[PDB]
Amino acid sequence: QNNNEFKIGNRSVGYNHEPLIICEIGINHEGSLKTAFEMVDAAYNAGAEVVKHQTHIVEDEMSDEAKQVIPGNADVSIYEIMERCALNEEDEIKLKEYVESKGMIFISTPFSRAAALRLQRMDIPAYKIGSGECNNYPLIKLVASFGKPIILSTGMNSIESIKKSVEIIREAGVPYALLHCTNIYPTPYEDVRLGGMNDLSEAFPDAIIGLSDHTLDNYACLGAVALGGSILERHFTDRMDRPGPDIVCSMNPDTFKELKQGAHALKLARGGKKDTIIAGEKPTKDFAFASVVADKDIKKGELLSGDNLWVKRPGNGDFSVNEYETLFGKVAACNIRKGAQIKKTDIE
Amino acid sequence: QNNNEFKIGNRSVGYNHEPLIICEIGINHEGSLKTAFEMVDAAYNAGAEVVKHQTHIVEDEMSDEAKQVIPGNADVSIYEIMERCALNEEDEIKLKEYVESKGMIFISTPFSRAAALRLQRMDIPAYKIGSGECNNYPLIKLVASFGKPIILSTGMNSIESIKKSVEIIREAGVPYALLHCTNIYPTPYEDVRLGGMNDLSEAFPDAIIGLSDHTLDNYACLGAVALGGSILERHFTDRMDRPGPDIVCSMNPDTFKELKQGAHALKLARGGKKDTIIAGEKPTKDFAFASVVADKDIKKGELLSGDNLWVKRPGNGDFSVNEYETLFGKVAACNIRKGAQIKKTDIE
Ligand SMILES: [Mg+2]
Numbered sequence: 196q197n198n199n200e201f202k203i204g205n206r207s208v209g210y211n212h213e214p215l216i217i218c219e220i221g222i223n224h225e226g227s228l229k230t231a232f233e234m235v236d237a238a239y240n241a242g243a244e245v246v247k248h249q250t251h252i253v254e255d256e257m258s259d260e261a262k263q264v265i266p267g268n269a270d271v272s273i274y275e276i277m278e279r280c281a282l283n284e285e286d287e288i289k290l291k292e293y294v295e296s297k298g299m300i301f302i303s304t305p306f307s308r309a310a311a312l313r314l315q316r317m318d319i320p321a322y323k324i325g326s327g328e329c330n331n332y333p334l335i336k337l338v339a340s341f342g343k344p345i346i347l348s349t350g351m352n353s354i355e356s357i358k359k360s361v362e363i364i365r366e367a368g369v370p371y372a373l374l375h376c377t378n379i380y381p382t383p384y385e386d387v388r389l390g391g392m393n394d395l396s397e398a399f400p401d402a403i404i405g406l407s408d409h410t411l412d413n414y415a416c417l418g419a420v421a422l423g424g425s426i427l428e429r430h431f432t433d434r435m436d437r438p439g440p441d442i443v444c445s446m447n448p449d450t451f452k453e454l455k456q457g458a459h460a461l462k463l464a465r466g467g468k469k470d471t472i473i474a475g476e477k478p479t480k481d482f483a484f485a486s487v488v489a490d491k492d493i494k495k496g497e498l499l500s501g502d503n504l505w506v507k508r509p510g511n512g513d514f515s516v517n518e519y520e521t522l523f524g525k526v527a528a529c530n531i532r533k534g535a536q537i538k539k540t541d542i543e
Numbered sequence: 544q545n546n547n548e549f550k551i552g553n554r555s556v557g558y559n560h561e562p563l564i565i566c567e568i569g570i571n572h573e574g575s576l577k578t579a580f581e582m583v584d585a586a587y588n589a590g591a592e593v594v595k596h597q598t599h600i601v602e603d604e605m606s607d608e609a610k611q612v613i614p615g616n617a618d619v620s621i622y623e624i625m626e627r628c629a630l631n632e633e634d635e636i637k638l639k640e641y642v643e644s645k646g647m648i649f650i651s652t653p654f655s656r657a658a659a660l661r662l663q664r665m666d667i668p669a670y671k672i673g674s675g676e677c678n679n680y681p682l683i684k685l686v687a688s689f690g691k692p693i694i695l696s697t698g699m700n701s702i703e704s705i706k707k708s709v710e711i712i713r714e715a716g717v718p719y720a721l722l723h724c725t726n727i728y729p730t731p732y733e734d735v736r737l738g739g740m741n742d743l744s745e746a747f748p749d750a751i752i753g754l755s756d757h758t759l760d761n762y763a764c765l766g767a768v769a770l771g772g773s774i775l776e777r778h779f780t781d782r783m784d785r786p787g788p789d790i791v792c793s794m795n796p797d798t799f800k801e802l803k804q805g806a807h808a809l810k811l812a813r814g815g816k817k818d819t820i821i822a823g824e825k826p827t828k829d830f831a832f833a834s835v836v837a838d839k840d841i842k843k844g845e846l847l848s849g850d851n852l853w854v855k856r857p858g859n860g861d862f863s864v865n866e867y868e869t870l871f872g873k874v875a876a877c878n879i880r881k882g883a884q885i886k887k888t889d890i891e
């Protein structure tokens with residue numbers, strides 16, 4: 196595929212590295228630092244490498260109009276949901292310390308100028324930009340000016356619209372990833388369109404490519420790895436009985452571990468070339484390929500033909516099945532017994 | 544990808560159809576028709592559509608040399624294994640009837656001229672050709688002359704070598720599939736090279752493409768489906784504690800069902816295009832996209848600038864974030880309150 200790569204802290208990402216699973220706790224903590232810690236613990240104990248937050252400062256994120264619009268996966272205004280689940284600056288700092296105290300990488304998605312500036316003050320190692328902000332060129336300009344790598348979700352946006360955000364990122368000179376994404380909560384399998392990842396890599400040859408997913412299980416992400424994806428993001432919860440509008444499409448510790456194991460296998464199995472010679476097949480080639488044999492008793496002086504020659508395993512005969520027709524018309528230099536492999540000494 | 548398709552009996556196969564899982568009982572029955580029936584039952588009860596056999600007539604399959612060569616996954620000669628597990632013509636006919644009595648499709652792999660002729664007499668709906676015979680051009684010629692579709696495994700062979708077999712198949716005028724395959728029992732993940740499927744489809748645009756697999760689990764096949772594969776073949780057993788050299792890489796009823804369910808999800812999720820507009824994202828676009836707002840109180844007559852304008856959710860404002868910079872230099876036609884969306888009536 197490609198050899199693009201960059202570092203998030205000490206963790207390299209890209210086609211030639213192990214796929215990175217981003218555990219998006221998001222708003223799943225419902226505004227409780229204690230709940231967030233329980234989810235951070237569950238992620239740690241499951242083997243997570245990265246916990247991602249969402250940084251919500253509602254007054255800079257939304258105008259008063261947001262109090263009258265309802266998301267497809269809720270029954271109250273987006274403003275109410277965000278004001279309910281937002282952690283304040285003091286608590287988010289503690290959350291980052293807690294994640295890092297567990298040896299994991301902390302990143303977050305700013306949904307506003309104020310949030311981006313908060314995260315720059317905390318000095319996070321990379322920035323996630325959500326699909327809603329993929330076309331927020333002013334906010335992308337700000338985040339790119341921080342000089343850290345950017346992971347950009349691309350849901351709800353065309354290649355043409357994405358080109359403008361990538362132009363800004365390239366101008367700031369930071370490496371970046373593009374996550375294919377579909378922003379329906381939850382997303383039907385039929386809307387995932389894994390082919391969109393190929394479209395992104397074709398259009399943006401310098402991007403690390405991955406998938407942000409909101410389906411009900413791991414299949415989409417496993418397919419993303421088979422296609423060459425390097426970053427996988429799903430929401431994460433410690434328990435599936437938690438309340439919250441994103442819980443239903445979340446992984447838990449057990450399904451995280453399943454994704455991690457499947458991503459490892461598919462990282463190994465993906466790519467490569469048909470024509471590569473595999474040493475381990477040699478014993479099979481040696482017995483499974485066919486050699487030319489006599490199909491009847493052939494007397495000295497008789498001509499070899501398609502009527503007195505055939506081919507049978509194994510592959511150690513003087514003439515392989517690929518040389519079958521070249522023997523036609525040759526002269527038997529001695530009697531040849533039916534069923535015997537044709538020897539170089541059998542022909543004149 | 545493509546719209547190639549053909550019928551195996553009443554079952555259409557190809558990119559636009561449900562992936563077909565071939566339950567390869569093979570030599571797993573260890574020569575016992577009773578055992579083969581138990582495996583056919585297990586496949587039926589698990590939901591299998593196709594049971595595939597192997598047709599071994601050892602005298603036409605192997606010369607005496609085969610009694611001295613040992614496969615990588617056994618400790619006796621290939622001749623001994625095949626003579627031990629082969630079903631005679633009477634038993635194979637009963638096996639085909641039994642499979643069909645269960646509503647499933649019966650196909651088989653001939654390893655010899657005599658076996659191919661036996662299967663033509665039984666009138667099977669399609670022929671599998673194993674990777675060992677992919678370069679057995681004489682045998683392919685014979686099988687292609689039967690006028691039934693061919694499913695050709697391509698392990699241990701180059702594209703160049705495969706082109707000669709496909710030429711023969713095309714000349715006979717039958718539709719065909721190409722299964723990418725690696726013939727190590729079992730196959731390490733790192734040797735699967737799922738990219739080989741892309742190589743085959745590029746070289747042979749008229750082929751239905753799939754995977755024949757000998758890994759220890761379903762990951763390779765699930766990746767094959769994500770990449771567009773239409774046919775999946777794994778060995779199949781009723782129970783994993785059965786003896787036999789291929790049992791260890793076999794699926795059983797539970798892992799068959801898991802593959803069937805994963806292949807369904809990935810058939811739905813695969814392919815497609817990034818730029819497709821998804822109706823279900825519309826509610827999210829409506830609240831998640833940003834509109835232009837006043838970043839400070841702006842007095843009538845003042846000019847709009849990057850210093851007194853910003854952007855915030857939701858997306859119902861008169862000016863979207865993509866129009867942000869076009870407002871620069873416009874004149875406020877009235878006082879504009881900090882935080883308000885910019886209205887078309889706010890500018891001269
Ligand atoms: Mg999300």
Ligand SMILES: [Mg+2]
Nearest residue numbers: 567755757778
């Ligand atoms: Mg096999």
